Amino acid sequence: VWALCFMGSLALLALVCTNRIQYYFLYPHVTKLDEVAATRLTFPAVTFCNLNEFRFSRVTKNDLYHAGELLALLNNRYEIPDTQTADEKQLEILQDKANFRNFKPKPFNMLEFYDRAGHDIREMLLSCFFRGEQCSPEDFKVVFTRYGKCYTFNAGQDGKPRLITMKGGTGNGLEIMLDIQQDEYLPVWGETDETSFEAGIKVQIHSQDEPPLIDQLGFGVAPGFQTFVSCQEQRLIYLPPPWGDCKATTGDSEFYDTYSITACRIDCETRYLVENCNCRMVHMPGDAPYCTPEQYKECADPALDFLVEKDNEYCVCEMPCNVTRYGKELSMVKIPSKASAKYLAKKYNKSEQYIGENILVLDIFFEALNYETIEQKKAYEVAGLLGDIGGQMGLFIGASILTVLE
Amino acid sequence: VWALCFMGSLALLALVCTNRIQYYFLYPHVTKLDEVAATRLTFPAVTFCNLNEFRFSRVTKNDLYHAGELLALLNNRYEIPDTQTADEKQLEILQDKANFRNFKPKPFNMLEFYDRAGHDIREMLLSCFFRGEQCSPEDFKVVFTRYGKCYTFNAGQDGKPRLITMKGGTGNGLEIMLDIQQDEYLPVWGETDETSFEAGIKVQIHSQDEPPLIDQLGFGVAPGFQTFVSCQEQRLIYLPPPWGDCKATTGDSEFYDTYSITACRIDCETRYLVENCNCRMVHMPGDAPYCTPEQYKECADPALDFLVEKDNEYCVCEMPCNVTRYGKELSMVKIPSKASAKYLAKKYNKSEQYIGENILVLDIFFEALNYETIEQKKAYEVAGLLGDIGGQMGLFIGASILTVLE
Amino acid sequence: VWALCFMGSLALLALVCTNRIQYYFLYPHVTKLDEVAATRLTFPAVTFCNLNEFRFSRVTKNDLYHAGELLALLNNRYEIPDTQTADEKQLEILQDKANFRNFKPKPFNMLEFYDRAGHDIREMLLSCFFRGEQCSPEDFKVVFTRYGKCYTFNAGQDGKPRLITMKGGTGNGLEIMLDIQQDEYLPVWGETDETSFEAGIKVQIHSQDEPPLIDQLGFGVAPGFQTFVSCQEQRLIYLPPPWGDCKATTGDSEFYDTYSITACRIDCETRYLVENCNCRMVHMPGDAPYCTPEQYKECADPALDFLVEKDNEYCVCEMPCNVTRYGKELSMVKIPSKASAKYLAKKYNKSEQYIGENILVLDIFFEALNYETIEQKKAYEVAGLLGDIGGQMGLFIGASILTVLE
Ligand SMILES: [Cl-]
Ligand SMILES: [Cl-]
Ligand SMILES: [Cl-]
Ligand SMILES: [Cs+]
Ligand SMILES: [Cs+]
Ligand SMILES: [Cs+]
Ligand SMILES: [Cs+]
Ligand SMILES: [Cs+]
Ligand SMILES: [Cs+]
Ligand SMILES: [Cs+]
Ligand SMILES: [Cs+]
C-alpha cells in the first residue's frame, strides 16, 4: 500500500539529480579577487614619446626633400604650400633649405630619420629619480613607435636586475622632469598622421614582456603641470579550453616570444602592411623593407589607419590566459609656481616663459593596496558532482528508512 | 556495549547537518567577474553641454525682461544691478537692450529660450570623427538638461543602426574638436543656478536607453587641452527577490520605458516639482506647464536644489537588476602647440588668443580589456543541499559499517 | 566472478575521495563583490595641504635664523646664497630680516613655526558647501603632516554627528573654493624636502579613523581649475589566519587606537626616527622631543626619505582584516571664465591675474553606485566536505546495487 509514491520518490530523485549533472556540463566558474598590499613587487616598464616626431633643427635639406610632403611642409611641386601659416623667423629658415636648385637627392630611410631627427632623451630628461636613486638617460631603452624615437624606462632587457617596489606612495616609484622642447616642434601647415595640434607627451605603463601600443592605448601628460599617476597591478588569470577560451600564456606567436593582446595586434599589422604595400613601417618587426616617405603617404598610413579604426574583421585577437592590467588614477598640480619659476629658468639656462610652456613633472607609483589578483576558479569539480549525486541516490534509497518507519 | 556513542554519532550528524540547512536559508551568493576583450561591442551615448547656458548675442530684449533677474543681470526694479562688474564694451550693449521705456512684454517660455539662445552644435562642432568616419551635427541629438540645450552623440534613437567597437585604442572610438565660444558667455554679475564661474563643457557617458543626469553625474573637460578618456563597459547583474532585492530590468516605471537609477530619479523630480510649484522645468518629461522665469527663481530651483543636495527621504530608488557602468581613466595634453596655434587660428578664422582659450579636443574610446561582467551567482542550489544532507545521513548510518567492523 | 573490479570500484572511490579532502586543506576562498546604490552612507574625511609650507609674510627674523638653511634661504655662513634667483622687490625684504647684526637667537620649535607661518584655512577657504549647507573654517580640523599645517574636513572627532550621503552627484557631496595664495609662497632658491616647484594643493580621501599619509598617497589639485572627484567607497573584508593572513581590525597597535596600513607605517616611522635621530618630526605622535631645524636637515629628513623610498625591510605592515578604499575618477574645467573673472576679482578684492593663478574649486562626491563590498567567502566548509565524502562512500558501497543487478 505505502509504496505507490516510493516510485514517486524516484521522481524527486530524477528531477533534482538531472539538474546537478546538467550544471556540471555548463562548466561554470566563479571569481577569486584579492586586493592586497604586496612586497617584492616588480615595477612595470614606462614608455613615453614626444608628440612632436621630428626636431626642427635636425631636419636637413635631404630630409625635407624625401619627407617634406608627408610632413605637410611641401606641396606636390616640391615648394612651400601656397598658403600657409607665418612665420617671419621660420619661413626664412625653411625656404632656404627648401631651395632645391643645386641639390641632388641622396639615399634616405625613415628609421635613420626618426633616429636622428627624433627627440633625444639626453636633452629632454632634466631629472630622473627612482626610489631615491637618480637615473640617467642610460636607464632608458630606445624604442620605435608610430610616434617615432621613444623611450622605455625599466625595459628590463639584457641582464638588468629588474627594479622592485615595496609600499605605497610617490617615494616608492619613478619621478621624471621633462623639457618637451616646443621651440623644436616642426611647423604645422596641414594635417597628416605625423603632425599634431598638441604639445606634451604620450605615456603607457606595461609589462616588460609586452610591447607598447602607445598611439592607441597610452595616456597624455600636459606640459606645465606635475602629474601624479597612482597605480595598481591587476593580475587576471583565466581558464583553459573547457571552461573558457584562453590561449596559452607561454608563447608562441610570430615576431615576439610572449603572447599578449598587443603583440598579437602588431603581429598582423606587420603582415597586413607587407601583404598590401610591399612595405613595413619603422616600428614594425620582421625583415621587410622599411617604408619610403612616398609609400607612407600613399599606402602605409591609410593601411594602418584602416586597421586601427575601421577594421572589424582582419586583425582580431584571442584572449591570453594571463593578462596584466594597470589601474591608474591621474592628478595634477601646476608647475612652475610664481615663487620658483625664476630658479628653474636659471637652473636650465631658459626663459621664464619657456619653463611655463615646456617643463613637466611625471610621478608613477602604486597606492597602498598595490596588487590585485582576479583568478577564475572552477565551481563544480568532478568529485563534487559524484559526492552530490551519490548523496542524492542515498537520500531516496537511504532516507526512505525513516518514512517507512512512520 | 559499543552502541552508546552511536547515538552520540547521531549528535555529530545533527550539528553538521543543521548548519548546511541554515546556510541554505541565508540564501548566499558569490560573484563572477570577467574582464575580457570583446568584439561587436555597442558604443555608449555621449551627452555634452556648454557650461554657459545662453549665448550673449541671442539674448533679445524680451529675453532679458522675463529672465533677466534669474540670470542675475537685473535687480528687482528691472535695471542693471547697482554694482556690478565692468565691462566697457558690454555694458554699452546690455544697457541698450535693458532700456524698457518703449517696450511691452511679449509671450515667453524657457524651452524656446533655451532652444534659441542655447549654444549651437553647428558652430561648436569644428571636427567630428568616429572610427575613421567623419560625423556632422546630424549625428548629434538635441537633449535638454538643467544646463540647457545639450547634445547626444550616438543616441541611437529612431531606426539608427547603432555604432559598434571592436578593439582598444583612440582609433576605435570618438574624437571631437570644440569651440566653447567664450566670447558668447553671458556676463556673470551674481550667483544663480544658471550662471557659472567656469569655462568648459560637461560630458557624461551612458546607455542609449538611460537618460542623462549630467548636472550631477557628468565629468568636465577643460578648454585648451586634448582630453583622452579610456573606458571599460561594466555589466552588473544582480539576483531577484529571494537572494537580493533588485527591481525587474524590463520596465516598468513612469515617463521612460526602461527602469534605471537615473530614470527613477528624474521620474519623481518631475512629480515633486509638479506637486510643489504647479510647474515643471524644461528638461523634465510629462505634460505639466513649463516653469516661468519667476517660478524658476522662486520655486523650481530651490525645489530641485533640495532634492539633489538635502533630501534623505523623498526621492530614493531601488536597485535595478541590470546596470551598465563605465569605468573611465582621464588624461590631458595641451592644445594648441606654439608650432600649430597659427594654423588653427587661420583655419577657423580666429585670433591665436581665441584658439588657446576656446579650443578643445575630446577622445572617447575603450582600452583593450573593454568588457566586464559582474554577475551574482547562487552559491547553494536546492539540489546541492539535498546531495549534501543525503551524503550526510549516509555517513553516520552508512560509514558506521567500518567502525563496528573495528 | 563479477567482484574483481568491485575492489577496482574501491580504486575509483580512493582517487576521487582523496582529492576532495586535499581541496579542503588548501583552505580555498571565493569572492563576493557587490556594487550597489547605498543609503545613509558615511562621508569620508578630506585632508588637504597647501604645497607651500610657510607663508612668506609670517617668516620672522628668528624664524629665518633657525630654519633658513633648511628652507634653502641661507648658506652655511648665515647669509643669502651667493647666486641666487632675483627678486628686485623680495630680496629687499629678505636681506633686511637676514641682517643678524643686532640679533640674538630666541627659543624655537618647528611645531609652533608650522602652526604660525603655516597657511591659514580662514584666509584660504573662500567658499565651503556640503549638501546645501554652508561650512566654515570651524568644520575643518587642523592636522600636521610632512607638508605642515593641514586641514581635515569631516574629521568627525569629538561628539560631531558624522555627515551622511544618500545619492550620486555633485550635490550630495562637498564643494570648496580656495585661494592658494601664490603671493605668499616662500622664494625657492634651492632644493630641499620643504620647498617645491609646484603651486596647488595635495588632497587625500580617507576613513575618519585612519590618519593621512598625504605626502605619499594624496592626489593633486591644480589652481585655475574646477576639479570634479567622483568617488566610490570600497569595503574590503578578508579572512582570518587559516584562510588568509589578516591582522585583527579592532586594534591594537601603538600610537593610534585602530589598526590600518597607514597607522602602522607612521607607528614605526616614529620609532625609527627616535631610535636614530633622538628626535621626532612635527607630524609624528608620541612624546619625544620635536626635531630642531638642524636635526631636520642633518638627520630627520634623510631618515624618513630612506623609509619612504629605499627601505625594503624595516617598516613593512601586515594586511588588516577591514580596509576602506576610495575609487576616484578625476575631471577638470577652467576657472575663471572670461565672462566671470572680473566678478570674482571684485568679490574677493583681487587682481584678475590673481584669480586666474590662485583660485580653485574642488568637488568631492560619489557616483550613483556609491558602495562596493569585496568580501572573501569560504569555499568548502567542514560540513560540505563530510556531505561530499559521505555521498562518495555511498556511491561505491551504495550504487553498486544497480550494477550487480545488471
Ligand atoms: Cl589592429
Ligand atoms: Cl533626487
Ligand atoms: Cl615606511
Ligand atoms: Cs595626427
Ligand atoms: Cs616568436
Ligand atoms: Cs551654478
Ligand atoms: Cs513608461
Ligand atoms: Cs620637495
Ligand atoms: Cs594604541
Ligand atoms: Cs557539495
Ligand atoms: Cs555533496
CB burial readout B37-60, b (16+ within 10 A) else e: bbeebbbbbbbbbbbbbbbbeebe
Q: Which residue of A has its CA nearest to C360?
A: A333
Does C245 share its domain with C290? Answer: yes
DSSP of B270-309, one letter per residue? HHHHHHHHS-B-TT--SSSPBPPHHHIIIIIHHHHHIIII
| CATH number assigned to the domain comprising residue B91 | 1.10.3590.10
Using alpha carbons only, give the angle C208, C209, C210 rounded to the nearest 5 degrees.
95
What residues of chain B lie within 8 A of the CB of A196, using their CB? Answer: 337, 340
The beta-carbon neighbor of A219 closest among B131, B331, B369 is B331
Report whether A221 contacts A333 (CB < 8 A).
Answer: no
Sign of CA dihedral B234, B240, B246, B252: positive
| Distance between CA atoms of residues A112 and C85, nearest Å | 42
Smallest CA–CA distance, residue C190 to chain A, in Å, is 8
Return the SS3 of C153: strand
The beta-carbon neighbor of B394 closest among C329, C342, C394 is C394
Q: Which domain holds residue C313?
A: 238-321
DSSP of A2-64, one letter per residue? TTTTTSSHHHHHHHHHHHHHHHHHT--EEEEEEEE--SSEEP-EEEEEES--SBTTT--HHHH
**For residue B316, what are the CA distances in angstroms to B265, C119, C143, C166?**
7, 41, 36, 8
Q: Which residue of C has its CA nearest to A35?
A: C236
Which residues of chain C from 50 to 89 reach within 8 Å of chain B, CB to CB?
A: none
Report whether C266 contacts C255 (CB < 8 A).
Answer: yes
Q: C220 in contact with B at a CB cutoff of 8 Å?
A: no
Does B251 share its domain with B219? Answer: no
Burial of B133 from C-beta contacts in 10 A (0-12 / 13-18 / 19+): exposed
Give the closest ligand to the alpha carbon of residue A166.
3
CB proximity list for C191: less than 8 A, separation 6 or greater: C72
Give the closest ligand to the alpha carbon of residue A312.
1
Residue B96: phi, psi to the nearest 5? -70, -45
Q: Which amino acid is at A56?
A: F
Does C399 share its domain with C257? Answer: no
What is the end-to-end Cα distance of chain A in Å, rounded? 13
The beta-carbon neighbor of B336 closest among A197, A309, A317 is A197
The beta-carbon neighbor of C226 closest among B31, B220, B374 is B220
Report whether B368 contacts A262 (CB < 8 A).
Answer: yes
Which residues of chain B from 246 to 285 reach within 8 Å of chain C, CB to CB?
A: 261-262, 265
Does B343 share its domain with B387? Answer: no
| Distance between CA atoms of residues A147 and A154, nearest Å | 20
Smallest CA–CA distance, residue B329 to chain A, in Å, is 7
CB proximity list for A56: less than 8 A, separation 6 or greater: A90, A183, A184, A185, A186, A187, B339
Q: C215 in contact with A at a CB cutoff of 8 Å?
A: yes
Does C205 share its domain with C327? Answer: yes
Give the closest ligand to the alpha carbon of residue B363.
4
Does A88 share its domain with A214? Answer: no
| Distance between CA atoms of residues A151 and A258, nearest Å | 21
Report whether C291 contacts C282 (CB < 8 A).
Answer: yes
Interchain CB distance below 8 Å, A339 and C376: no
Report whether B265 contacts B315 (CB < 8 A).
Answer: yes
| Distance between CA atoms of residues C214 and C223, nearest Å | 18
| Distance between CA atoms of residues B229 and B173, nearest Å | 10
| Distance between CA atoms of residues C68 and C62, nearest Å | 9
Q: How far is the CA of C209 from the centre of ligand 3 (A)?
A: 19
| CATH number assigned to the domain comprising residue C2 | 1.10.287.770
Q: C156 in contact with B at a CB cutoff of 8 Å?
A: no
Of C255, C290, C321, the domain-final residue = C321
What residues of chain B lie within 8 A of the CB of C338, using their CB? Answer: 182-183, 185, 199, 357
Q: Which three cell numbers stand for residue C216?
A: 605619499
Q: C400 in contact with B at a CB cutoff of 8 Å?
A: no
| Distance between CA atoms of residues C218 and B172, nearest Å | 33
| CATH number assigned to the domain comprising residue C307 | 1.10.287.820
What residues of chain C lie within 8 A of the CB of A377, using their CB? Answer: 28, 30, 379
Query: How many residues belong to chain A?
Result: 406
Q: A37 in contact with C at a CB cutoff of 8 Å?
A: yes
Helices A382-396 & B382-396 angle (0-180, nearest 10): 70
Burial of C349 from C-beta contacts in 10 A (0-12 / 13-18 / 19+): exposed
Q: C183 in contact with B at a CB cutoff of 8 Å?
A: no
Residue A278: phi, psi to the nearest 5? 60, 40
Does A250 share its domain with A362? Answer: no
**For residue C42, what are the CA distances in angstroms to B354, C38, C326?**
44, 10, 13
Q: A164 in contact with B at a CB cutoff of 8 Å?
A: no
What residues of chain A lie within 8 A of the CB of B35, using their CB? Answer: 236, 323, 325, 374
Chains A & C: contacts with CB separation below 8 Å: 212
Of C278, C301, C321, the domain-final residue = C321
Report whether B61 contacts B182 (CB < 8 A).
Answer: no
Return the SS3 of A111: helix
Interchain CB distance below 8 Å, A37 and C317: yes
Q: How far is the CA of C169 from the centre of ligand 4 (A)?
A: 36
| Distance between CA atoms of residues A177 and A129, nearest Å | 9
| Interface test mutation site (partner B, options C176, C226, C230, C333, max chain B beta carbons within 10 A) | C333
* Cis check: omega of the bond before C252, within 30 degrees of 0: yes
Long-range contacts of the stretch B192-196 (C-beta < 8 A, 24+): B192/B70, B192/B71, B192/B72, B192/B297, B192/B301, B193/B146, B193/B301, B193/B305, B194/B53, B194/B54, B194/B70, B194/B71, B195/B53, B195/B71, B195/B72, B195/C340, B196/B51, B196/B52, B196/C337, B196/C340
Does B97 share its domain with B24? Answer: no
Using alpha carbons only, give the angle C287, C290, C291 rounded to the nearest 5 degrees.
145
Return the SS3 of C276: helix
| Distance between CA atoms of residues B345 and B353, nearest Å | 9
Q: Where are the beta strands (DSSP E) in C40-81?
A: 41-42, 45-50
Return the SS3 of B41: strand
Of C321, C337, C354, the domain-final residue = C321
Chains B & C: contacts with CB separation below 8 Å: 212
Smallest CA–CA distance, residue C317 to chain A, in Å, is 8
CB proximity list for A115: less than 8 A, separation 6 or greater: A149
Q: Give the residue carrying C-alpha cell 537685473.
A: B74
Interchain CB distance below 8 Å, C390 and B387: no
User: Of A120, A139, A100, A239, nearest to A180 (Cα)?
Assistant: A120
Sign of CA dihedral A313, A314, A318, A319: negative
Q: Which residues surround ligand 9, an ion (CB under 5 A)?
A: C 257
Q: Which residue of C has its CA nearest to B196?
A: C340
Chains near B, with 3+ CB pairs < 8 A?
A: A, C
User: Of B209, B208, B242, nearest to B376 (Cα)?
Assistant: B242
| Distance between CA atoms of residues A338 and C87, nearest Å | 11
**How many CB atoms sit inside 10 A of residue A2's CB?**
7
Q: B169 in contact with A at a CB cutoff of 8 Å?
A: yes
Does C398 share its domain with C277? Answer: no
Q: Which residue of A has its CA nearest to B166?
A: A312
Smallest CA–CA distance, residue C173 to chain B, in Å, is 8
Does A254 share its domain with A301? Answer: yes
In sequence order, the β-bridge partners of residue B149 are B144
Q: How far is the CA of B32 from the centre of ligand 11 (A)?
A: 22
Q: Which three cell numbers stand for residue B18?
A: 543543521
Q: C104 in contact with A at a CB cutoff of 8 Å?
A: no
| CATH number assigned to the domain comprising residue A131 | 2.60.470.10
Q: How far is the CA of C154 from the centre of ligand 6 (A)?
A: 24
Q: B337 in contact with A at a CB cutoff of 8 Å?
A: yes
CB proximity list for C131: less than 8 A, separation 6 or greater: B309, B310, C163, C165, C171, C172, C173
| Distance between CA atoms of residues B180 and B355, nearest Å | 10
Residue B272: phi, psi to the nearest 5? -60, -50
Interchain CB distance below 8 Å, A332 and B336: no
Segment (H or E) for A373: strand A359-378
Q: What's CA C68's distance to the chain center, in Å?
A: 29
| Interface test mutation site (partner B, options A31, A183, A305, max chain B beta carbons within 10 A) | A31
Does C171 share its domain with C223? Answer: yes
Does A90 share its domain with A168? Answer: no
Smallest CA–CA distance, residue C217 to chain B, in Å, is 18
Report whether B40 contacts A241 (CB < 8 A).
Answer: no
Interchain CB distance below 8 Å, B339 and A52: yes
Report whether C163 contacts A315 (CB < 8 A).
Answer: no
Binning chain A into helix, strand and coil, the percentages to the nearest 5 are 30, 25, 45
DSSP of A291-338, one letter per residue? PPHHHIIIIIHHHHHIIIII-SSSS--PEESEEEEEEEEEEEEESS-T
Q: Which amino acid is at C341?
A: A
Q: Are strands A359-378 and A225-237 parallel, antiparallel or unpaired?
A: parallel
Q: A34 in contact with B at a CB cutoff of 8 Å?
A: no
Q: How far is the CA of A295 from the centre of ligand 5 (A)?
A: 27
Report whether B7 contacts C365 (CB < 8 A).
Answer: no
Interchain CB distance below 8 Å, C216 and A169: yes
Interchain CB distance below 8 Å, C216 and A332: no
Q: How far is the CA of A330 from the centre of ligand 6 (A)?
A: 26
CB burial readout A245-265, b (16+ within 10 A) else e: ebbeeeeebbebebbbbbbbb
Q: What is the domain count for chain A?
A: 4
Using alpha carbons only, give the angle C304, A126, A93 rounded to the nearest 5 degrees.
165
